[PDB]
Amino acid sequence: WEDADFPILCQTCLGENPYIRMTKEKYGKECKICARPFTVFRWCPGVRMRFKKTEVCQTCSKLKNVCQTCLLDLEYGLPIQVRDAGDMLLKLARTTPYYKRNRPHICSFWVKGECKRGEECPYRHEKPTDPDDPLADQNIKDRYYGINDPVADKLLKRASTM
Amino acid sequence: DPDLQRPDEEAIKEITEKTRVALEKSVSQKVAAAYIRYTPSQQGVAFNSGAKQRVIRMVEMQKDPMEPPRFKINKKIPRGPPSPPAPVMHSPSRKMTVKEQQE
């Protein structure tokens, strides 16, 4: 059917430490990249991280050559719409990635005001993003396929500014 | 005697023990259904530098042994429909005789 042995992920999603821990769940989690169950590999990126898992399928991510969790690229980091446009990947890339890719989700009780968890709340009790921007309006195939990619649109537009 | 040599009885028993362990692993898989360190040579240059081995422990999560399956029948392609098409090279095919159509 669909089996795997090791996750093809990026160094940003792998965690900011040489030693990590993986958890393999064979044939589960319903990977929507190929509509087939894959080995869901959960891990911990570090202290105060998101502790996410694998989302895309194994064979479905081999043709795209992107991360298992971030699903951007393999070496540069641009989206698939920006990678298929064009070196163009040398200038659009950026080393030392931000912690927002490994940051946890927001607290819905903090947005509602009744954050009864307190200082032991694992979620981030900060302000959410602006919904007027297209950066918080992506989808499943919108990030995987190059069609309707808002992150790739601003990457080619801001590349010619000065 | 070296050209027509027979294999050892211990080598045949070791091949039988490996085949019995392989058949028992397939029978246990049929009855059930019916650390590591990967060197980041993809983009490891400066982002989280010093990761030469990138050790990740493979801890298998013990699932609940009473549950419906998590998905339906998998409609994914497991392998490749091309093959290694090894050539015949048996004999040169030629005509038999002029009387082969009459025989």
Partner: peptide, 18 residues
């Protein structure tokens, strides 16, 4: 390229976290 090791998981997780 995967390359497993036969080291202990207890001493490895204790040394990296320290």
């Amino acid at each position: 390229y995967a390359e497993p090791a036969h080291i202990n998981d207890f001493m490895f997780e204790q040394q990296r976290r320290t």
